[PDB]
Amino acid sequence: GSDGWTCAGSDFDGDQVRGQARHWVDQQKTKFSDFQTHDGVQLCHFELGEGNQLTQSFTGFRAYCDEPGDVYNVRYWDVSSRTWVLCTHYDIDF
Numbered sequence: 001g002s003d004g005w006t007c008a009g010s011d012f013d014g015d016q017v018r019g020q021a022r023h024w025v026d027q028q029k030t031k032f033s034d035f036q037t038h039d040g041v042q043l044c045h046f047e048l049g050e051g052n053q054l055t056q057s058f059t060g061f062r063a064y065c066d067e068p069g070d071v072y073n074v075r076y077w078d079v080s081s082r083t084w085v086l087c088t089h090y091d092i093d094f
Contacts, residue, residue, distance in 0.1 A: 001094065007061060007076035007087035014089075016052055017063050018071055023054055025069035033064060035075075035084075041066045048074065061087075 003014035024030050030044035037043060043064040049055045060077045062084065075084040 001092065003089065003091045005074040005087040005089050007074060008078075008085075010061070010076070012048065012061070012074060012087075017048065017074065019052055020046065020049065020054060021063055021065050021069065021071045025065060029056075030065055033062075035064060037066060037072050043072060 005012045005014070005017065024046040030046050033043045033045045035043045035045075043066060045062040045064045047055050047057060047059050048061040048063045049059060058077075061074065062076075063074045064072050066072055073089070074087040076087055077083075078085045
């Protein structure tokens with residue numbers, strides 16, 4: 001199995017996103033977001049780098065975690081709409 005997110009034209013590998021998340025949670029340096037899960041839990045985000053790259057700077061992509069640290073969703077910044085748009089999670093089973 002493999003998984004990931006598709007953000008309009010950009011692909012992110014699930015394990016790579018989760019690796020970044022593990023780091024920022026461990027660091028206690030996720031950031032308060034304006035978004036919540038479907039269950040009402042407040043999400044914190046980090047700036048999502050390409051590959052395994054770790055960054056605190058805007059990339060146009062954010063991943064969102066709950067307090068236990070799990071990645072819930074990924075968004076991309078849409079310049080035309082001036083909003084953070086949900087990316088689509090995909091799961092591939094072989």
